[PDB]
Point group: C3
Chain length 207, copies 3
């Protein structure tokens, strides 16, 4: 499954920071019950690859790795069973490797030079990151109107209040956010409710 | 003619999106009558290279291509007769190719690394894009005071109201804007009047 | 001395634009008397390498070069006696060269791709520049929370009022600023007082 398809499965891609492996299964189950099957587990905590291997066992879960900073990490996340890969930015190295490896990479962009490098490598789906701190929807629209063939997932500072505005733009296939898994102790009921709310967001884009 | 000379010809560089080839000659005539000889035709529409070939026949018109994403597009724009090339960002590839080809490229920058990559390739004139979404004049002043040898053309969200503020800064040679060719149906009188207005903007950099 | 140590010496790294070589010694003396020993002399003026050579003779001065755009300029700044190097951004070339040369480079980053390139080269201390124009503390926090191993010095639009907010974040080791050497005629008393004031900023990191 290529990255464009992953982006269309759900309106919101939860960005998970797993601080305790005990939380992995319940978080994943709650998200999936709520209709958010596509899970980005960030490689920001030491227990992240275990957490991935655990969520991967949850039926319906499409588990990816975030915070993939280089080819090494991408290779590790792959071995662990990740179906796609998110990185906060793009380097030529990470890109060339993802392409070579047929890996569904969703790399971060912040400006035209980033997208252009992406395009040169044969990539056309990017994470706009960190969205709210680098110009927000206005900045993304400017990029979208220049790179017509490109589609985005904005992440960074997006909330339940701002997500539907981004999703009204057809250049945006989904948004990333952590508001869906709050605090630090998992409340399966709260998570499932926030996920239901979020999985019902309308998108302009043909999903 | 090198890119610095192009930038000094006029205070405003119209950013044209030509949707109907019938409009190319009249738009170009109107702009040139108005004192805006330097025309950026964006490669955002299917008829853009024809349009360039038409405007190129207009006496006094200095026609360039915008939205040049890669070396392929640059080569095509060149074959078509473009005198200069604008891109929304800069890659090492597009840059090395422009330099090699002696093409007057005016590439987009959004931050210091972009400028630094430009400088390494032997380029010192950049488009700051999309200006109003990446910090505006305050951001551009910061860059300008660091890269003293560099000069800019900001494009992106600039209006008749903001253009003279950018043009007061001597690091700015001109600005790009699309306000000069409004709507989608050409009014030669309106265009010429808006161009006269804009061609009389004072610039610190050019008397 | 590596770059992480330079960053910890003082809370504020003055960013100096020396417009007149006569001003170099007095500025450096005043800053050092004020407890800001770490001086970044930007290579933005024609007299900057002379200025560096002068400030380098000032006892207690740790002099670096700023606005190092490439390997050539780094090598020149080195020859002139600089102990560390700051650049507004990072290129693979400048980075590879700094690493190869064991030079304490503090390069500018503005987004994740910049940091990622840094990390690939073995660097983990960056200047976030120009801070106030590319998202400020909020943007920096977003970066810091993604790149947990990295530490920053924000520069660009920082003031005495905002500097302590940045320094409360433990990902930030120090800030750069020019407010400490005002105007364009040096007032040794004003400079020393502003430097004392700035040298007493608390930092979460140190």
């Amino acid at each position: 499954r290529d990255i464009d398809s992953v982006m269309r499965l759900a309106p919101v891609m939860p960005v998970l920071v797993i601080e305790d492996i005990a939380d992995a299964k319940p978080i994943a189950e709650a998200l999936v019950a709520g209709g958010l099957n596509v899970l980005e587990v960030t490689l920001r905590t030491p227990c992240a690859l275990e957490a991935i291997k655990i969520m991967k066992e949850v039926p319906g879960a499409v588990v990816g790795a975030g915070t993939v900073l280089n080819a090494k990490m991408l290779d590790q996340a792959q071995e662990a069973g990740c179906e796609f890969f998110v990185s906060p930015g793009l380097t030529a190295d990470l890109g060339k490797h993802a392409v070579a490896q047929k890996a569904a990479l969703l790399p971060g962009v912040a400006n035209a030079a980033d997208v252009m490098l992406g395009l040169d490598l044969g990539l056309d789906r990017f994470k706009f990151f960190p969205a709210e701190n680098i110009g927000g929807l206005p900045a993304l629209k400017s990029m979208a109107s220049v790179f017509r063939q490109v589609r985005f997932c904005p992440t960074g500072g997006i909330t339940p209040a701002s997500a539907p505005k981004y999703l009204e733009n057809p250049s945006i296939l989904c948004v990333g956010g952590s508001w869906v898994v709050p605090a630090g102790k998992p409340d399966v009921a709260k998570i499932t409710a926030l996920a239901k709310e979020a999985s019902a967001f309308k998108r302009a884009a043909v999903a």
